[PDB]
Amino acid sequence: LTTEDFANPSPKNWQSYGFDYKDQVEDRKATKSTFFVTVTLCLVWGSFYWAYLPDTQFRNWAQREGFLELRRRELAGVDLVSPNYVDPASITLPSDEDLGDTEIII
């Protein structure tokens, strides 16, 4: 080889990309389409779709309801977090003779 070949390289001699080692046409389609369906679609358009996703898990609504329940409970004498799951008058409270020897767990 001579210095005229290296100074003016050949179009027909092509360094192959990683996809297809048989045809130059098959690389220049596979790189473009694989970069389109991964980088443009999944990582940019998919990230844009996720950025403007609605409250599928209720977190912003739970924050709004947290402000509203702190607004109403500070107005009345009811405490800010209820200690009990339901009202204790609805609790049946079975007697000690009815329980006998039963495991009570706190």
Partner: protein
């Protein structure tokens, strides 16, 4: 108002920052915007797990979902109260030992009530498990006195 040259320079830099953004809002962003209405979403009260039967599964779903939603609502109750305490700490920078003690008292009472309702249930907290916890806790305060006294 320009007491010091540093404050006058800061006012000038803040005016240069403030001008184009409020021009772009009031001239471009605030025109051509339509007036749509969105509402805070409101929920009814499904019947609680007390009224649910043993074999019924259509109502255990509703009771478990309202238990999860009430757990979420109490979670940002405690979170908002913690941010109220932190804003008290930042705003009263040299005197947070006096102003933030009642806010810390409400925060500690809220954490105690939150652990009394939701504590030790675990990752899989159904509406059944909290009701069994409340029944066993009320049985313990009926027989053995309050929790932490003894017995």
């Amino acid at each position: 108002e320009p007491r010091s040259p540093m404050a006058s320079f800061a006012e000038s830099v803040l005016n240069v920052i403030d001008g184009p953004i409020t021009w772009f809002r009031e001239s471009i962003v605030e025109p051509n915007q339509q007036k749509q209405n969105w509402y805070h979403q409101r929920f009814r009260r499904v019947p609680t797990i007390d009224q649910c039967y043993t074999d019924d599964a259509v109502c255990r779903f509703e009771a478990d979902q309202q238990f999860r939603r009430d757990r979420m609502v109490d979670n940002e109750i405690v979170n908002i109260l913690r941010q109220r305490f932190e804003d008290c700490t930042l705003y009263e920078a040299p005197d947070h030992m006096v102003k933030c003690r009642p806010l810390m008292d409400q925060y500690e009472k809220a954490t105690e009530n939150w652990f009394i309702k939701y504590g030790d249930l675990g990752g899989y907290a159904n509406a059944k498990t909290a009701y069994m916890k409340q029944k066993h806790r009320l049985i313990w305060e009926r027989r053995h006195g309050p929790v932490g006294s003894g017995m």
